[PDB]
Structure 1
Amino acid sequence: ANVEIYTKETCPYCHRAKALLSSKGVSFQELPIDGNAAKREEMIKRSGRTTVPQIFIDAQHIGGYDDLYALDARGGLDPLLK
């Protein structure tokens, strides 16, 4: 599954999403913005937001933890990730 999450040093909702994904025990990628700028610009073209957490599930930009956790709440996260 193609899963990516942009993050930073101080992002409580990043920790929220990652804690759920580690409870599910899925395989995902993390993308730090900590000192970054060129891949933060990448996140402009990708997300159209430039804020975090911003999860992408099978390259599909979901949005943040609440958006992701809703995708889990509908049982729709699992058939993409697992």
Structure 2
Amino acid sequence: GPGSMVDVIIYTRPGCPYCARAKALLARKGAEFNEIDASATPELRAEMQERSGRNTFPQIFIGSVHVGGSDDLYALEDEGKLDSLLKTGKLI
């Protein structure tokens, strides 16, 4: 039982899409996040290819729930749905 909470993931290359926005919040809450090297496999490239555009902010992944990325990740932090998000990751 290393962590009663869940594991968060983020779709972004190792430095250059500039995912400082997604980390900006995670840093303020000392939350955990896992980077994903894209442009390497058709499984990820195809996925990010859909949420890609103007090399906008990266995408966030919480458990079995999808997230638009920084836009939603930040939106929830404001409304007050980040706690239960980084703990479970619900869409409600």
SS at match of 1:29: coil
The match for 2:16 is 10
What TM-score results when the alignment is normalised by the length of structure 1? 0.73
The match for 2:63 is 58
Asked if 1:68 is matched to 2:73, the reply is yes
* CA offsets 1:20-58 (integer angstroms, 9 cap, x no match): 10210012211121x5123424x62xx682535010122
> Does the 8 Å CA contact 1:2/1:59 hold for their aligned counterparts?
no
> Does the 8 Å CA contact 2:10/2:58 hold for their aligned counterparts?
yes
Gaps of at least 5 residues in structure 1 are none
Higher strand content, 1 or 2: 1
Higher helix content, 1 or 2: 1
The match for 1:24 is 29
Moved beyond 4 Å, runs of 4+: none
Distance 2:76 2:50 in 1: 19
Rg (Cα) greater in structure: 2
Inter-CA distance 59–15: structure 2 relative to 1 (3 Å threshold): farther
State the Cα RMSD in Å: 2.3
Distance 2:50 2:60 in 1: 12
Q: Count residues with an aligned counterpart.
A: 77
Identity %, equivalent residues = 45
